[PDB]
Amino acid sequence: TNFTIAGHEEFIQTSSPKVTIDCSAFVCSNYAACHDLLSEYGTFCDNI
Amino acid sequence: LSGFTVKPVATVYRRIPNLPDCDIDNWLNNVSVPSPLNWERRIFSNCNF
Ligand SMILES: *[C@@H]1O[C@H](CO)[C@@H](O[C@@H]2O[C@H](CO)[C@@H](O)[C@H](O)[C@H]2NC(C)=O)[C@H](O)[C@H]1NC(C)=O
């Protein structure tokens, strides 16, 4: 016999933080031997 | 591109001066050589060698 109007809310996730990883700098710091050894592995960092 | 790092511009060197010597040669060249059954031990700390 009588009515009103209610209000709801809804959140839908759309985006996400764009995470970029420096594979070379993460696996090896500023050291020469580490980079020299990592250069003999392949393209793992490239694939990442 | 690949990462980089700021190159150092100086060098810090801090050490305690005016310290005695360890004198390990006087301990190794003693006239009292023990045996493996009663081997001896001397601790060297706070000295220069
Ligand atoms: C060589 O060994 C002797 C015998 O262990 C040392 O003489 C003893 O030295 C200690 C100190 O490290 C003293 O407390 C003892 O009284 C000494 N015993 C003695 C004199 O019979 C001696 O110091 C060692 N080093 C040298 C350079 O001789």
Swiss-Prot record, chain A:
<feature type="glycosylation site" description="N-linked (GlcNAc...) asparagine; by host">
    <location>
        <position position="2"/>
    </location>
</feature>
<comment type="function">
    <text>Mediates fusion of the virion and cellular membranes by acting as a class I viral fusion protein. Under the current model, the protein has at least three conformational states: pre-fusion native state, pre-hairpin intermediate state, and post-fusion hairpin state. During viral and target cell membrane fusion, the coiled coil regions (heptad repeats) assume a trimer-of-hairpins structure, positioning the fusion peptide in close proximity to the C-terminal region of the ectodomain.</text>
</comment>
<protein>
    <recommendedName>
        <fullName>Spike protein S2</fullName>
    </recommendedName>
</protein>
